[PDB]
Design a protein around this nucleic acid. Sequence first.
RNA 1: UGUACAACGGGGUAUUGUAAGCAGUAGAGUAGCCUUGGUUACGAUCUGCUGAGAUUAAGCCUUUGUUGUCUGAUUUGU
RNA 2: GAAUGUUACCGCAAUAGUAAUUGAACUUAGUACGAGAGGAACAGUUCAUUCGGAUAAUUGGUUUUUGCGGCUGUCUGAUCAGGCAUUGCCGCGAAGCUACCAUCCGCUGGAUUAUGGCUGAACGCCUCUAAGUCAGAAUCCAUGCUAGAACGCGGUGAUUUC
RNA 3: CAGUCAAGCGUUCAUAGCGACAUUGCUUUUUGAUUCUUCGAUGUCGGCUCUUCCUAUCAUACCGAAGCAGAAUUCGGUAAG
RNA 4: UGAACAGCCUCUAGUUGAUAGAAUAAUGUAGAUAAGGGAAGUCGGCAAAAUAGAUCCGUAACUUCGGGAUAAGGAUUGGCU
RNA 5: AUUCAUAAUAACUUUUCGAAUCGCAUGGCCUUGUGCUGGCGAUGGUUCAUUCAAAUUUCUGCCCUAUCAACUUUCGAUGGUAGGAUAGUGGCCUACCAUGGUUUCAACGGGUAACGGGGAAUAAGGGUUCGAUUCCGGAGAGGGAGCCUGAGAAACGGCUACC
RNA 6: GAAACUGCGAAUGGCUCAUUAAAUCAGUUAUCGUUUAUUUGAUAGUUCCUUUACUACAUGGUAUAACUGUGGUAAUUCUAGA
Lengths: 171, 136, 126
Amino acid sequence: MKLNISYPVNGSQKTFEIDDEHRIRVFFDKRIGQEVDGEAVGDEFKGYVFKISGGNDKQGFPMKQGVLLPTRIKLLLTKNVSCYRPRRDGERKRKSVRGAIVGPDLAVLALVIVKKGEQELEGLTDTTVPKRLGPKRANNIRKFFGLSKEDDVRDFVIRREVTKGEKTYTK
Amino acid sequence: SGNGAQGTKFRISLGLPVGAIMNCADNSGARNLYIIAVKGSGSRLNRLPAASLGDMVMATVKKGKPELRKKVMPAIVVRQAKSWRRRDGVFLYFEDNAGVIANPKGEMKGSAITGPVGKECADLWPRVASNSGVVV
Amino acid sequence: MKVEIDSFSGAKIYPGRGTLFVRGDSKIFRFQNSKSASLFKQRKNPRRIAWTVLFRKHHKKGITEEVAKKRSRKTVKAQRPITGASLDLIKERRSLKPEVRKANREEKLKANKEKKKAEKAARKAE
RNA sequence: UGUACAACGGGGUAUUGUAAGCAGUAGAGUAGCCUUGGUUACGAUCUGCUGAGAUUAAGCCUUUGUUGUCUGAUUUGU
RNA sequence: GAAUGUUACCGCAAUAGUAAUUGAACUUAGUACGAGAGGAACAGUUCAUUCGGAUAAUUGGUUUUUGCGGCUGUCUGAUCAGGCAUUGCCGCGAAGCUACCAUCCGCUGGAUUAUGGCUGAACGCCUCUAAGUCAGAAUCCAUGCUAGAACGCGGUGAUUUC
RNA sequence: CAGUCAAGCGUUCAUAGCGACAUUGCUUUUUGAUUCUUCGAUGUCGGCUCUUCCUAUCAUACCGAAGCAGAAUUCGGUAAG
RNA sequence: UGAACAGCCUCUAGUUGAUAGAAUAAUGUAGAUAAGGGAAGUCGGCAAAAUAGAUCCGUAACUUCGGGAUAAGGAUUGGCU
RNA sequence: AUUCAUAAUAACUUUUCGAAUCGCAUGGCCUUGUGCUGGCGAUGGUUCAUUCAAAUUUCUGCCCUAUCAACUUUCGAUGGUAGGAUAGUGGCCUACCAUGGUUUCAACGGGUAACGGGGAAUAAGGGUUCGAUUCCGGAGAGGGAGCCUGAGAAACGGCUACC
RNA sequence: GAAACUGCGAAUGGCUCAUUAAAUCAGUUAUCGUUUAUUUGAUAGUUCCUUUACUACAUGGUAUAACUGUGGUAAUUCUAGA
């Protein structure tokens, strides 16, 4: 069973192939919004706490929160809802969606780390991923870099360098 | 169940004896199927032959398209009302009785199947599985 | 083993026991005992029937699954480096942000001088 | 004359389905009184006490509890 | 069921009966064979026909548990609680019983018939036969199961101080 | 219902399979033949249920023969489980 | 209660009289039920089973024009104010 | 032709709008402050008018049949009263009241191998037949039925449900 | 200047004549009984409401698309977590 675990701050994700059946029984009779035991999910996650954030069952089906059913059902999704993106103006197409209750059919189960334990895992927590880009709004960069009303916020912005081998661009 | 069946089928409780009328589950134009006999049935004194889910039988069209009438044609039972036990341990049964007209070889005469079809019947006859919409 | 839910009452369904029913439109129904199935065929409302879980859910009878809800008091408020700006350089910029009034005044004076030079150049060109 | 047996009671389990009674600025309303604006009488039912009440072995299990019982008559020999 | 010295336990086994039968699908095999259109079989596996023995955990059935709840006519002054209507009606319904309508199971050793043979004379050859001998049937006898001669049998404990 | 002889069918090829003209027997599940028992009384047809027995064997088990190449199909033997 | 001297319960009046007792085997008598098929059983829908009252609407062929007719086929039925 | 357009009062609004938008050009007021004033436009915006239109609607006009003489009126039919919905008038729907409305001047029912018109073929004049089709209007995206977006759709080269 | 967000268009056009006999349609009217993006012309000095602090108007708040990494599915203009 694939366990897709995400870790904030470091911002890294990794899949753990939990073959053992005794380990994945903690997710049984659970639903997005609860917590699971790091010792229960495996031996190397001692002292860890995880929060379920959905996933997908066999054949690949989005996990929609609020279904509160252990089996898949066909729902009429609409605009501004997850698991469906309007391809037109007002178009509402119904699709089969996996239930929120986690059962013995989740091929890939998605969690997010809540707190860090004593032991550290692989690159999942051993790698630090920086942000893709900084903010754009003047007030946003002001509150980011910690300036005042009159502090010349234009100068204190992102100045990342990209080089083609003969010239550098700050962009 | 011995003409062109792919593998055997686990025993199913028989609740469709000779004389039963089942609603037709195909677009061949027939409205009902009248049981006339059961292929591969038993022999016993004063015992009425009976059909189960997926068993190949012979039937006549009592009402429906005129050409289908006054003839005998093979049929495959796709829905049986009598409750039967599967090897999984649960007991399941269908709302009514229904069958599909087919040739003795196994190919479906119709083009589509309306309503749920038994998983045992679908597995036993590949044409039924390939022609059905939903399998339970 | 797989454990199911009764359609009529929400009762727990164990392997071996129970019955399964399908309607003409291919709908799955599971009944734990003969009573629930009999009421289902009698078209009795599970909501109206008292001993089903639906009636208790509506009437808040023994609703004690969660004593108190859990909510986030505040955001994560985590700090991470952004792009190539680097965490050390970001911290240095944050530390150097105060006492920048003199630098701002010098920049404003330089900009005013540049604007005056540009105006003089435009006047000369015209 | 004791890990004894029997009759009750308790618990477990099961069946059924929310008991009597009380209270309700819950009641389609009806007929009365002057604080013509709230109250007096009748009113299927519902709501809270209440997965409550009733039965539970006669061919379900147990019983540190109450209560009792444990010397009646015949027959048999190589 | 009396009589065999009483009673109780463990037993043997003469006799008597017998039981299991068949088919489909996968592989062999689109192979052997067959110019060709056609098309197997042994061994192995999964099932299925009929019959037999059990047993209710699951599914269904039976309702006098008259167990609970609801309903109609009448009666106890009204409520509660109850009587009758030959078991007043309906729904659910515990226990028992039952359903190839639910479940499991139904053994392997020898001797033989037809047949195919071996050695070998009659009949210097030949020959399955005259002597002997091999394989061999849903056959028979055995393994096993049921009842156990109430006059078939064995072992074991106590046999009454009054 | 079962044998014997053998003119032929079977492309040549009596007995792979049929076997004419003739002839020898078998059972009383058909029907006749005589009325010996019964007319001071054996309840007479058919159907349902049920037990057993026979082989003149439809299939299953084991084999032989064929103008049996396979499949199918035709006879014969042991065979009533 | 009910259209009713239909069926049921009660008032006045009358009776408590049908040999009784202990358990609830097979087979029976009367009353019953039963998952799927719905007459395939049987000489034969024999037996048994379903509707059945009232109200609303709707009623074919035929005919002697009076009938068929409650044709057939459908909807409602409680309590309280 | 108005209870018209319009104005003033007493209040009301899950408060509608009354520019937190974009590209070029660079001038003046003092004073030397990025202090104050300065066009071309674009987009957007509250209403009115015009246009694009849409929606009903006045009178007349459509093939053959009576081997179709009465039709509609339970449950909407002919009108009113009052209310709901529409963007609007209207039985378009709702509760009540009245029994009304059309018809031998061809109602109503049946078929049309009938989309209608502008027009085409053919004749002294009259007249006969055809018109799906290059122009206008109407219906449809296989039969229905429902709906979001959108000013404008029961939209199908937009979805949902049944065949 | 890819892609994407945003605003419009996709209710235009093209095809067929199934249904339809006061219905469509044609001639001819009304909206004083209605709506209208679009282009054209005009058209907001009042919006702080214990309106002395309750108040960024040198113009303030928030999420998100693309993107970077994890993938599931046999498959579709399929999608979930950071």
